[PDB]
DNA sequence: AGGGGGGAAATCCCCCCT
DNA sequence: AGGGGGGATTTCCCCCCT
């Protein structure tokens, strides 16, 4: 088949996520709209033949780490994943997962990277271990507001990674009894009589893959390590 | 561009994950060659007018959940995240997230679902809560055992010792003897110093498939698409 | 807000076994 | 693969102080 059906087309401009390919100079050669309106474009073909220095977001300041690891795919063939946290032009921080994997040509030669990312909300880090470990017994599955405050929420990301509070209080330079008065206030919020039940019942409720708005303070661009 | 070229074809063909759509009755309309390949259809082709429970793949024991999120995604609108865990033709387990969207038409009505999968099985992405803590200042040859790659899983996702044992249904003492092993392979002086090394050498992108031994489909969140 | 006392319980890590 | 003993050190969670 060396056409697509017109409706396989519209799943083509459908698909989720922002993504695209590049060439072997990293030189845009197509972005999905998703990925334009991102990066600060109402037309997002005006993406191609530009390359991540040349676009009106401040994740033009990384653009020598995105090529780095574009050449890094290009030169192993290997794919990898970035985590990325950068402000972009609709004036918020925005954290995603970019997969980068080798962009091939019709006889199998690397020609390019392509991209794909998706928001961080779309992926799941924390509820991995936490449905794992409920794989003893028996659950139920059915799918179904709340505010905290900057400091609330960094010790309650601190608590889901499982650090300890004498950990949580030398690194935020608080007192462990002022940790414990935050771990009460968060037990009070969401519930929950045990500190055991509070991290149960804040992964059920999507913050194993959030990361609170005062932690998106610096760019990064990291690729995550795999074991091939 | 009422047309794709053939490269911006080649990207399609090639666009990474398991993804794919299906109408109203969750009939497979369209599904990309990874996918084919991860259900058991050689040529993916052959996905097109079958349903869930009519794939070549032990999946098919979970088609109705499949379908029930078919239909939360066609009723609400919504992206939906499940967490996906099965065995599959080629003999193995497999974790994979599933996000699926509504499917629409020229006229923005909803014909059908979108899904589109990504395997985490060896490419996990804990590391990204050390990363964050390193960049904001909040922060400081090997081979295993099965068992040993099952302890350092469990506290590189912060469970503590009556959790561990609960789970694996051994007793502290012999979680401990299993931390002690691995404090030795790795280097490492304390509890602490050995998750920040192992994170560091990437077993935070581990899922140890001895741990993946039930079928699993459950939806973790959903949310609007602006 | 940030910091604290105190006591039951749990952890950490040394040593010991089949 | 699967078990402990024991003791120094911390959690844990109820009170409490500026
Ligand atoms: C935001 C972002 C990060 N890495 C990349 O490679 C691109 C193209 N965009
Ligand atoms: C493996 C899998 C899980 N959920 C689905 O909806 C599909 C189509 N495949």
Redesign the interface.
Known sequence: P?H?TL??????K????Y???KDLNSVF??ANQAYGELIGLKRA?DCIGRTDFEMPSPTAACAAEFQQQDRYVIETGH?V?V?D?HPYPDGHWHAH?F?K?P????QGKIQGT?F?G?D??????????????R??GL?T?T?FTLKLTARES?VL??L?????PQ?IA???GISIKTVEGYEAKLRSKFGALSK?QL?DLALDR?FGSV?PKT?L??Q?S?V?????
């Open positions: 060396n697509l409706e396989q087309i519209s799943l083509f459908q698909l989720p996520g993504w695209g390919c050669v197509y073909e794919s994943k985590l946290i997962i997969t994997t962009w091939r040509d019709s392509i794909f998706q961080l909300t779309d992926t799941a880090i924390l509820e991995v271990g936490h449905w794992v470990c794989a003893t659950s599955s799918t960094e990301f601190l889901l990674y499982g650090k300890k950990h030398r690194v935020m055991d991290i999507g990361i932690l303070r610096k990064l990291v995550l390590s795999d074991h091939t």
